[PDB]
Amino acid sequence: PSVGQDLPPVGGYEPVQWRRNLPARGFRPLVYLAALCGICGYGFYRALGGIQERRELKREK
Amino acid sequence: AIIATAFAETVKFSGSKQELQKRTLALYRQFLRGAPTFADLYEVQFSIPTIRTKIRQEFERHRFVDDLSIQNVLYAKGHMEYQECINFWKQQAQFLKYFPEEDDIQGRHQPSNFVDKFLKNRA
Amino acid sequence: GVSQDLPAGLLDDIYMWATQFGDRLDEIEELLTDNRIWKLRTVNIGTVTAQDALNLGLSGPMLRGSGIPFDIRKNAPYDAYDKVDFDVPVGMNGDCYDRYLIRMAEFRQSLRIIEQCCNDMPAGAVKVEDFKINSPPRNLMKEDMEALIHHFLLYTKGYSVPPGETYTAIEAPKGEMGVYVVSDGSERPYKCKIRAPGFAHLGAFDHIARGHFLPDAVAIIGTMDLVFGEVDR
Amino acid sequence: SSSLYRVLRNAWEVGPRSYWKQLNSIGDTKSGRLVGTDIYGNKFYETDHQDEIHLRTRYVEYKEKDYD
Amino acid sequence: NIYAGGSAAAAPPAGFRIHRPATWEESEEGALSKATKYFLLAEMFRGLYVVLEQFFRAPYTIYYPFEKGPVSPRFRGEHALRRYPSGEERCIACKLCEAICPALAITIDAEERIDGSRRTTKYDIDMTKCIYCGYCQESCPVDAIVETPNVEYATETREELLYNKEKLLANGDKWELELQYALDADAPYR
Amino acid sequence: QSVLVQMREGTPIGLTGIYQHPNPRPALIALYEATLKELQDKHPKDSVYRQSIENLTAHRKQIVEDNEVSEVIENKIGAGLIEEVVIQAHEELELAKKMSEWKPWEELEEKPLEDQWVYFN
Amino acid sequence: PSWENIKDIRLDPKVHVDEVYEPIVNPADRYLQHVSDLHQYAKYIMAALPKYIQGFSVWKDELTLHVAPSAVIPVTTFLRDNTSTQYKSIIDITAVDYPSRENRFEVVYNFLSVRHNSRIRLKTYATEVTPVPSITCLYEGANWFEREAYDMYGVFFEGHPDLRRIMTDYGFEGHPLRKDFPLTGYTEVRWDEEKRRVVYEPLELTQAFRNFSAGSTAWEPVGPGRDDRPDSFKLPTPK
Amino acid sequence: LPGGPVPVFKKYTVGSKGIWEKLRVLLAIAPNRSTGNPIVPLYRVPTPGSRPEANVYQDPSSYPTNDIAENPYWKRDHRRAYPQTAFFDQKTVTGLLELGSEATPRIADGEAGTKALANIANGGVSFTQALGKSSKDVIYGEVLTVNGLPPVAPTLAPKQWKIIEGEAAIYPKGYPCRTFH
Amino acid sequence: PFDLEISTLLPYVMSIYLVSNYGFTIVLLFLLILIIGFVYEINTNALKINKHNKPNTDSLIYK
Ligand SMILES: CCCCCCCCCCCC(=O)OC[C@H](COP(=O)(O)OCC[N+](C)(C)C)OC(=O)CCCCCCCCCCC
Ligand SMILES: CCCCCCCCCCCC(=O)OC[C@H](COP(=O)(O)OCC[N+](C)(C)C)OC(=O)CCCCCCCCCCC
Ligand code: SF4
Ligand code: SF4
């Protein structure tokens, strides 16, 4: 006889996760490069516009 | 362990006594050249000729050994002790195992006769 | 056998741990496996050819780093590992990176063992049947004259082993660890000897670590897994 | 958890004098329910609250400035 | 069939041959797509975002003199010589704790006392060579010495760490309410 | 002539340090024929060693002579991959060359003592 | 789909047997067919090298070849090189002293063919001063093992680069795992205040070692036991 | 595929609640990841010193061994039924090659057969002479295998490997570690 | 010699408006004369330390 022991459930446990859970996340790399070139080029727009404005200010002074 | 340590020798057993005599001769030469290195290396208090006379005395211990096989194990142990001493693996506290009586006088009341041994029942 | 029975509610607990550990180890895998720094620091470091891994006496994750499919719990199984289903990871290049990738998957296979043994645990006795090699329960030895005699003798004197010699080797996570014991026939072993797995690994250090740089003499220590209770004793 | 709202609401529940005493005592702010007192004199508390990690539930408030 | 000799049914498995490693030209990724991951450090940023997620979660630390960690009743700490109900020393000097102790910490002298009962004159444990195996507790038939779950008794001298009969009877005095809780949950499993 | 037994650089293979060996079977059958010829010339025909390695390499050489492709002969041989098999046939060739110097079919030169080989009954 | 609405494991029907049934069987019975195969293999190995193999013993799927010391190197090469054997990996090699024998130490070699999944043992002998030759020219991994078997046992390995002590003190005089060497040893260590170094002194204990081997059984505790020898490899009774 | 990703409500971890769960499904790499902390009412309640199962516990045993009356212990001891080391000299193998075996005895005239045994027992013939005198059928029956090949180094339970290649593998294609089953 | 260029580019960056269209081309030519010495350096692999951990290139030719 064996009373008072720990035993598994009669239906068993549910299955655990032992596979690798590494899902690929992010946009495509061409999306990040296109976004990079867009952010950069808009920055160059504002920067070179400000340089020309500062040149006209230097003319006035 | 392809390559061996610097001052190593592959252990090899000689069937003639005169080859063993040549090897112990070469080994005394190797200890005796390396005694200034030992005095520098272990930062000892005394002079180099005391190391050299310790080396002579430790060969004076085993001079009248007859058995070639026992001479062979004795040679191999001596070369291992040389390889430990020259490579600085032994430290100064185990280098000075070799000099127990020089470093300090242990005290008064050295028992020599039966009576002084008896009064302390050999301590 | 075993010292004593499990506590009353541990089997429902090892499951609750396993369910979250499966995710807690995916996360450690993220910043090492596809780190370019951790990759570059461990790519052709510690390369062991498969014919040199045998002459050096290397085993476990270092022999299975180098291509050879051998592990004791599948090849010569013991302690109910035959009844439990799992797979084995074995690298292909002898580097420190395939010794790394096979450790990362033996976590997975071990969690698979824990689940399959939580589900399939039977009932019954936990120590061996007889009281001439391990002690009676304290319920019984306070009632039984025979069992009090056996209890009082297994601790003053001990049990006696038949005269013989054995080398029994299992697979520690460090690699193959065995013990060679010579039994007198008395109740003390005439001779014991552990074969430390890391002893042969540290003994194979200068065969591998020639020609590497000084930083790469340290990431090779971490793969041969030197805990040093093994190597000297 | 490590939020500011938890330390704020426990500071409100425990009260400012016992807040200052628990702050000189521990770094945390804890609200318990007085399970009992010691023969040496050490009040013990147990925590109901939902946002408590495992092994955080029970604690001692000592009596002496020098505690063991 | 029949195998050669040097030959079992451990042939190579079906598929033990590797495939040749792919050249650069037989790859599905473009050069621009691959090198965007190269110069924009993609998986480095992924591993960065992992530990940024870990910044915003609950720590594990418990505060030690105010909150203690886990205890099972089987746990072992310092030693204690228990007493019977109505106060009797329980140690019948059977020397079984001495005979089993794997590090030879126990030393006992035993004499028949005035009652004619068998008791220990001297009981002693060296706690500097005790290894906490619990064989001394497993071996005693009267269950006279036990392991209390106290680990907080660290000292400043060695002399204090040598426990005679009197220190252990005072421990088995002090912890008896607690050892009740331990042996109510352990004694079926022993 | 000279023969190759193990590539130490080339197309990779499942084992580390081994690589793919070009033309395994002519090297294999020539290494076999060298084992057969030296073993027939230098060992006595009574001896059990000569008998079994002659039979063994005759069996292996028959399997190598029969089937045309690599993946089927390495299933019928029973050893590892054929690169590994060529290493083995090389190794038993060198063994059969050493045994003629050591001459082990002789009766044993160092008999043990009676006190030697006792183990507590 | 919440963590408060998760089911608990602790209340559910758990499996309950009234009574467990475990048949009883000798664990030596499962070996017997392989032990017979091991017998036939070892008889072949003795017939192949009759000059070098003095005996063998099969215990229970454990094979041991019994070989002279001047016969170490020719047997080991065979165990490496023959395709039927292929005992590539050295596992562990060590010594055991029987002080009652004239040749005091015996030196055991364990091998593992990872091809055939087989183990093998090779036992030779050596006295305190006479050697046994080293197999470290064959095996790159053996030499540390050989050298370990040096320091504990004093057994020599002729033809060994870097033979010296390992895993003992550097100035240590003696060979520890040896029956004449006492347990606690000869010396002890303290910090002398005067010389400002550690000093090595003769031994002295604050508690003496009490062995409890004095007081073992006076009844022969195990019998002779049965045998696993197959009917093919024991001598026929006449008629 | 049986051990694949399961969502985080089957994982016994303190997780999140309310609008902060909707926040962290957005700001995450994989949404089915626990936070590591065990649930306080579930994990280790009741504590091991206070269990209702310890009151009812009783020592386990199997039936043909806890039996009160049918077994005697000598039938079911196996420590005393240990087998011995089969130690074979060189001369007892000459006996097995020339006398024979108990399975196939090549001995007639047993009263003279004891004397035929006795000179080998004293060292009459040699082992190389025993191999040379032995017939080809004896050499190929008991020293060698029946085909004439050397006996393979025996293993107890042979293992046949099977490499798992597809989506059931532990690492996908491109990683230098393979699963071998 | 790379540091001395970076401090030689420092006079230009302050006068970049004055030398419009002309000092631009001179600084281009200056930087290009530097870049070809730099590609000499990267083609020789001067700063790279080799490893003498060669995996035994030479195969096993026998007899
Ligand atoms: C506080 C402001 C922080 C701003 C973040 C820093 C600069 C931006 C870096 C670009 C990374 C990125 O956001 O990429 C977006 C991708 C998710 O897209 P996907 O699921 O893989 O589908 C793409 C399928 N395609 C390819 C077919 C189109 O990655 C992630 O969200 C992972 C979590 C990073 C969260 C960073 C916080 C911003 C909230 C975004 C919630 C969606
Ligand atoms: C290799 C580089 C190729 C560049 C090709 C881009 C052509 C795009 C056409 C838009 C021009 C425009 O319309 O923007 C003109 C702007 C704003 O000037 P404004 O003040 O509004 O003009 C008023 C005229 N006044 C002053 C006489 C009154 O000026 C610029 O400089 C911004 C140009 C866009 C930035 C391009 C940078 C490209 C990235 C280079 C990364 C190193
Ligand atoms: S404590 Fe127990 S084992 Fe020790 S002497 Fe007392 S009764 Fe015996
Ligand atoms: S716990 Fe172990 S070492 Fe300590 S006294 Fe008990 S038996 Fe001895």
Could you please describe the fold and organization of this structure?
The structure is cut from a larger assembly and holds 9 protein chains of 9 kinds. Chain A has 61 residues and is an all-alpha fold. Chain A is built from 1 helix and no strands. Helices cover 52% and strands 0% of the residues of chain A. Chain D has 2 helices and 3 strands; from the N terminus they run H-H-E-E-E. Chain E is α+β, with helices and mostly antiparallel strands and 190 residues long. Chain E has 6 helices and 5 strands. Chain E has helices spanning 31-39, 42-55, 96-100, 135-139, 165-174, 176-186, and strands at 79-81, 106-112, 118-126, 145-147, 162-163. In chain E, the strands form 2 sheets. Chain E has a 3-stranded antiparallel beta sheet. In chain E, a hairpin with a 5-residue loop joins strand 2 and strand 3. Chain I contains 3 helices and 1 strand, in the order αααβ. Chain I is mainly alpha-helical. Chain I is rod-shaped. Chain I starts with a helix and ends with a strand. Helices cover 51% and strands 3% of the residues of chain I. The chains are: A mainly alpha (61), B mainly alpha (123), C alpha+beta (233), D alpha+beta (68), E alpha+beta (190), F mainly alpha (121), G alpha/beta (239), H mainly alpha (181), I mainly alpha (63). At the G-H interface, helix 1 and strand 1 of G face helix 2, strand 1, helix 3, helix 4 and helix 5 of H. Strand 1 (3-4) of chain F pairs antiparallel with strand 1 of chain I. The structure holds diundecyl phosphatidyl choline (2 copies) and iron/sulfur cluster (SF4) (2 copies). Residues 91-97, 108, 139-140, 142, 144-145 of chain E line the site of one iron/sulfur cluster.
